[model samples]
Target: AKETSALTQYMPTSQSLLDEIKEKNGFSWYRNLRRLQWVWQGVDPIEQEQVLARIASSKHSRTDEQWLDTVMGYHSGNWAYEWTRLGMEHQKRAGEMTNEAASEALFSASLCYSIAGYPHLKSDNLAIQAQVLANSAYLEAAKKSKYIIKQLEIPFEKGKITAHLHLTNTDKPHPVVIVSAGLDSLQTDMWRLFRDHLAKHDIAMLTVDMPSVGYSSKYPLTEDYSRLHQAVLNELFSIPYVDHHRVGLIGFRFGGNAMVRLSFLEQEKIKACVILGAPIHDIFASPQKLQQMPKMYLDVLASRLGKSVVDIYSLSGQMAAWSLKVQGFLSSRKTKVPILAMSLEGDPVSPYSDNQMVAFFSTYGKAKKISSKTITQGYEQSLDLAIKWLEDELLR
Candidate 1:
């Protein structure tokens, strides 16, 4: 009972301890245990072991990915609750320290939400709020962070593009790299991953939502999306610390796919391009194929394409053009630039095809310089190497 009492202190809400203990004991119904993993994934390892121990303590109905996703989501929700709760609690703490503590807590809350930023089999407000509130909270907290984080509202043809810029102070102009996030990630999420590391190298990283996701949701991604990158480039060049002549871009997943088109559009301005774990295809695979993808893919796609999962499962034909691809875009390109393409050989998203993308860049990109590496380790390690690859390509 004392061990059980200790676990209770970490529960999402007042009732979580009892609910968890109940669920742990084979006492939970189907609906109750559904979102258990969400909460489980957010806690520390000791707690994680405890949760898993309790879960394994029972021989319940079944186990599956759907089951695991919900389990994670609940933990994700707990993080938001705990951090946001602390932020509120610190509201009365006294002066600047109060603000700093609150801001830090809120930022921590944002991370909590974003870490679980996956679409669920059963969609709920928590999943949506996780990313939405993440953005809202981080923007508030960035003011207190050590690095320079400026929220940008860039005007385009129609409305505006919202983004964040992370930079280190420099007396002389330094090289800049725009970090583009994929489907499951947001501009805020990108900042968490690459900003601090890049900033340490005296480089600046700009993060923005892809055309139709997050704050950019109102703007549909279209053929003219190059306008977006161009505007950002134009703005970055205007910054005193940014070296106008040496600008590079690093994109992950779908964002990496977008880099192919941007390379063509911003040829003269783009000095180096690195695409990591991007999906390359002659044509977008069918909706059925996409449905078999990771849950983030469907969730983010539906959010971008503005469709329900049920509707997305049946979506086909012309609508799929909205998907990012290098085929047609690179086919007509005639500019050569430094390109680094990384893919996992047996990845579920897109199997890495040896020299497949490199051939396109060499042929279509009219490659001035080219390098390709298959990611042999985990995504985190691959990303570490990718950051190094950028330093090698841009810092020179």
Candidate 2:
């Protein structure tokens, strides 16, 4: 008999892994792993702490089965509700401020709203609503900011790909870097990446959503994950403010998988590529490894694939096609575009062996394993190194 439990597809949470994660990260939930990344992305650390506290204290059904469910509604103790409330507070503060201050506040509001929809699942109606609010605040913030922010709509399939292009100044065509985040995050979550790193280096930043995510929800994710990014790369020549010839790429998590693939397919077009914590092969090839992932991750992968009745074993088998090594890219030919791949030490997804394989397959590619002892500093340090690498490759 097949397991038909409503929560069966989500997979049961591994007790030892959960405890290990909580002991190391101070969060019992797998979805909350991005807490530190959120602070780096502009969410106020103190406010984030309070919001987490509020959700923990809020009264609601404490059933383990309902932990990963999307039926939480707009209740006080609900994850979405608490974060949405904080987002509203920032929106209110934005109304009271002026100029860059207002812009910053609105951006913060957008970040909170985006987080309210954290690990955005396609079936989650509440998260869908929260996404709308997040986009609105981000656009409002863009309008008031001193920096140049342009919304680019690249024609694709029967629809258009919506992307945000950030430029410090548009005096001349500037070197541009395309940025993308993981499956769970929105393109709006990439603002700090542009503002704190790319803008300072005079590198224009353009962010695109992963397939089946954010603005790209119309497209279902497939093994050909980089198809949308390849389309964007082709459209860059027409964008007036950015020099298409000096293009760089940065991808985080799953986005790195797509970017690395693109670097191989369009080596002549890309100047440099940087991948952080990206799963290049081992995890995808090992069904045992996929089975070991947290419930939230399995749900995300299932959601992205548009699976309604997921067979965990079948799903794990399907992921093997996503492996770059399995695709014959890394083993067949070396990409001319220099690549820098980095991941936190002991990262299961982007293992050191995977990074080394990526580095070995690309001309002048290098991999750096960051120590996890100082995770907060590692986040900043990795970006610093990534930007410096891009600068050397693109500015030279």
Candidate 3:
């Protein structure tokens, strides 16, 4: 049921309609856009911009948070080569230059960004070489930290939401971490690995494989993932050892929308939120970036979520639902917990603050930001920062 119509609800079906982007751009241009497309592929939009603004924002409250996420051992971000390329590419496409040369440059730049974006974000210890080393063993410590590790899921929607939990013999009720999986293979895979990391921290974990994703069969073309997340929350709260009050939500790529959507529904339950790269907008008022839909996914979602053919889809009702999306209606209602809106300097999908981070933060509660202006590492550093922050928030 949750998975049945969860997908296709708020976003597009295909990862990239780049090939289908009916604009005047030609092959090289389109391919370049496609290549640059997944820089933060699974990152959420709301916080995606926020994170960037956080890093670069000059606002008083946004700046005076006092402490940096402990996991962020250095002043860098994931994927160095990727960021370098993305940076140069961004210069070409983002400016007054939109010729074939600019397109080629941007595409080449994206390849770098794609390759470099997440490496810096991976967790690392104090060793000087920890940030960039050749050994998988160097990452072993990060992998074993029990802090949130970048992980993923396969959309197999059999139940409301099945969170992958890995815990140890600790008697203390573990802190909980929630992850939003967007439309990227990287983020999806990260969700699974991150669970192992969270275990090292003795923190409990939950990752929602949104509609049409791993194990989730239901794909609703018009539903909000929050309602589904709420269902998971309900189940999560049922655990006796879970520190319900300390539970936090983390999302990347399109999952940011889910974070925002759930913010409205579970506003009362969330202790803190960390948005990797999400769109911040009024769920209802936001305009659809594209018009095409994911046709094959529609049927797949229903079947996975255990829905019947008659119960699977309602085309008439679906179109009517999308009509209700209003950018102007995006919520500005803030939450009680500390919020981190982190973004990258080279991220192409999200433009700048006025469009993604600013618009959404302006609407919701008081918010702060962090910007990973340049690429330096992998997701571990980000998660390290997040884990440290969470450790302080819930443990100390």
Candidate 4:
């Protein structure tokens, strides 16, 4: 029991732990993550050992991608829970957070637990967990002080998409920018929480849930999902307080999928669009590119070619089925508005094919780009770039 008790004390270190270290290619990123491994390695090694053992017994060995994802997700879930429970308990004893503040903090703390951020990375490897967890930590640190940090559930037909929305203390009509997690990430509550630093300006944020994920999961097809999503945007635009014209859509992951479909439908309502980490087909549709794909991605090809989702789509084709129409959007020369298409350097799901970005510009976009990287190891800055660009389109 005592050994298990110690598990509750294992807190995933904050992403801000590396804030002072800017050199992404430097030794600090290694040090920051290595230290965490050792810390977690010993966080009741007995419990850790048991968790590892359970995984191995289930054939989900440490080397297995699923094992890696599940462990990272489970621990991170515990970390968020412990972070607030202990944090509030300590604050209450010290009389730091006022009665109202403490109550609010408690509510925020519980809400954070109900959502899943680490689970997104848990499906891969430790390296991915570290990179993404670092970003989540960065998000947490950026919002050190804020009254409202919320994740909303928007119901579609069946499943729901969870979105993180923030309202700054300022009462003025704030520009709302829509965001979703990049490839392989879900609602990204961690990213939403971190935007509290932006409270300095008059902008509000609507961190989105990708279709068939988060709150929009109920509507499987992009058309149905996009229409409902647009309805929500229209409501936000009509809000008596928010400036309707400044409203813009910013997508992460298959976000461009959402944007492309939204453009075909809404056209005028959405002012400017920025698509990050979305696959535009120019990267994966070619014969040469198909040969170079990793196993995880090769499966998508099987789906498109074989017309069988079981073998081809169990993972890749299944995912592709959700955005077949949007991926096709890149084939056109005409789009409704100015779009900033971007890709990350090291992302496996969406690679910057030799001229994929250029190809996108040549066809759909006007050759304008909003590119970014994970900042050596500065995960926060990458997220910051997303927010900054949105701020410009929605506010500036």
Candidate 5:
């Protein structure tokens, strides 16, 4: 009844709850307080209280574990004050620096903005402010550095898909990789992972938010949403400095699920694909997992769709629309592209095996020549190997 009361206070209707929250200040009202104490108290109360003390503010109280632990906690969602403080400090110094120092300062500022505003990326009220600070910081970083990050608007009938293209070097051509972010993850999350790695390998990265998420959340999810990739890919392929023949696709989480259609629709253009813990099949069927998912996660999905939870209950069914099987991959196997799919055995959200994915890839007609490796070694090692594969394939 307490949880029910909380929802009733800020109850979502058919209209967008996010829009309502945008001009409001009730994020804490939606949080489950007991949840935090239960999850953290027994493990380490001293450390938890210290963290709570650090995040203290007018909007977020030290004892207000609901808001503090839910949104501002280390692993919860976002950090409002701390990140803002760091961002302002970095931005102040960025103007005084030159060359690498300037770029480094500006990048630090961008990281601060990204973290501070991440939890509110889907909110219309806060999203603009967050994006403005983050995007400007990134642009400044690019301007100061030798390599550049170009902002682009991929044409979509509903609205343009916002993307950022990072070119390691402007002097010569380089192979490009298309990176897709998952449901709760935004394309901006690629900065830390791909920034240095791609630069070191002299590879370019094009990162974009999936429909109905990040900067594109205003656009609703559509039946033929996969077509959006074609438009974006076509635009990317036109870049004179990018080697169009060596384009690769890498999708993380739900974005990994998007690769099914992208690899199929753009197979002629895609040389390799890497899927990381994507729930491509039987994801929604698990009543237990769905029941176990945090309310915040589902709330995010509902907010992105601009619909009430009741209206968008069939979330997994909608995700199925992008599956390779749904697009008739079982019958279509004429062309074979190097696809590296990773599945963790005990993955909570997505539970599947490499063999299952390997069986599906066999439909691509390169079962013998292709490789399918299980990632039981560990997360970092697996990621290193996967990136290495992309580096090799993009060069090939």
Candidate 6:
């Protein structure tokens, strides 16, 4: 028997692919992929550009140290520190104002704090502290905002699942969309998604952290990836501000996997589902594909899996059981819940084939592949399409 070397297992064999990712993103490993999302979430573009500039010009910016070492700490050029400073600036501005303006400022502060902990890893101490700040600022923002933002704690397992419920007002029960971001981001990161898109349509937004992330960290990731979400869905019936009968769901990245699973499990309860860049099958089934992923992604997966010493080969093998196809969901029967499955044209995780498979397994599902020519614009376009789909199913 041979011992598998963890070091070699995590390293990417495709230098060209890594270079392409770096060229598109930047020198820093984690923040590169998150830049677009941060901007979309309402971080000032100029401020974000300046933060990146500072980080790029830092002494350790180009280091080959572990991703943690390169981005951690409270020094100049450190990722969290720079973002935290920006967050503090927003916090100060918030204090000088009141009502909606103050609320917006505080929300911006919270977004900055959340970004400071970008690709939030459980082992990253600085990221954890940044998350604390993010949560506090978000709560403050909720208090000042014109819209109602209720913090809900749904009981689950031995503990409670914390969720944020965003609504225009408490006038009456509003059609609600339950939203969850990818494994790397916090539920707090979904604030702008709700504020900009869902609120305009008079739909409430309920945000939950995927298991093993943020407020849901007590639960470990498993083949039953949708367990926590299912619990949240079930608890919706007891809430008065949201119309439980007209519930919709929106999930991004890995969260999309869970949302689709929940749709199948609780078909009658859900009105519709919109999934973006979810890994439903291919990526999990192919070990070669898994090994080709960047180290940052592998690290996130390992952290969520609660693996102390990862054997990437075994890890890849284990993920095969997680595929919705292999789990007998997508193949055996069609879900009554209509689904809109989407991804960017060249997304490896959520290939067109996966979206097509999801659509085929759904009663009135549609598959969409957004052009990647203008990646940022693609994000907005897809969300607009998603909201329209949900509005049709949920509000009709």
lDDT per residue for candidate 5 within 245-346, as digits (tens), equals 888887776677676567766667888777766666555444444433444555555555555433323553454554555556534563366677765555
State the local distance difference test value for candidate 1.
Answer: 0.54
C-alpha RMSD for every candidate:
9.9, 4.0, 16.8, 11.5, 7.9, 4.5
* TM match of model 2 to true structure: 0.92
> Which candidate would rank higher by lDDT, 1 or 5?
5
**How many steric clashes between backbone atoms does each model show?**
12, 0, 111, 18, 0, 0
Per-residue accuracy of model 6 over 1-396 as CA lDDT, tens digit each: 111111222334344454454456444444445434534548766897788777766775323433322533458877778889999999999999978999999999998998887677777777789999999999999999989999999878888999999999998999999988889888988777888889998999999998899999988787887888888888888998889999999988889999999999999999999999899999999988886676667767887888776666777888998799999999988999999999988887889999999999999899999976465688788989999999999888
lDDT measured at residue 15 in model 5 versus the true structure, 0 to 100: 24
Candidate 4 lDDT, 69-179, residue by residue in tens: 222333332333333333334334423465544434433432333222222222223323333443343244335545455555555445455556666654677776666
**TM-scores of all candidate predictions against the true structure:** 0.69, 0.92, 0.49, 0.56, 0.75, 0.91
lDDT of 3: 0.42
Q: Kindly provide the TM-score of model 4 when superposed on the true structure, using C-alpha atoms.
A: 0.56
For model 1, the stretches where C-alpha displacement exceeds 4 angstroms are 1-68, 71-107, 120-124, 286-288, 294-296, 308-316, 319-327, 332-334, 362-377
Q: What is the full ranking by TM-score, best candidate first?
A: 2, 6, 5, 1, 4, 3
CA lDDT for candidate 6 = 0.82
Q: Can you give the lDDT of residue 207 in candidate 6? A: 92
lDDT of 3 by residue, 1-396 (tens): 111112223223332341243232332211122323334433334534544444334232211122111112123422232234344444445344445434333333333333333222111122213222212221232243433322223223454444444444336777787777553322223433343356566766666655544334245423564555666676665666677887877767556556655655566787766665554432212224322222222333333234333221243233233221243224345445555555455443333351344334423332233355433243545556666665665564
Q: What's model 5's overall lDDT?
A: 0.59
**Could you give candidate 2's per-residue lDDT for residues 1-396 as a string of tens digits?**
111112324333343443344355443454645434633448766886788787666555543433432324467767778889999999999999999999999999899998888778887776788999999999999999999999999988898998889999899999999888899889989788888888887899999998899999998787788888889988888888889999999999999999999999999999999999999999999988786666677778888889876666778899999999999999987999899999987787889898999999999999989886465777888888899999998887
The local distance difference test score of each candidate is: 0.54, 0.82, 0.42, 0.43, 0.59, 0.82
- lDDT score of residue 93 within candidate 1: 37
Output the lDDT of residue 294, model 6.
Answer: 67
Candidate 5: residue 239 lDDT (0-100): 80
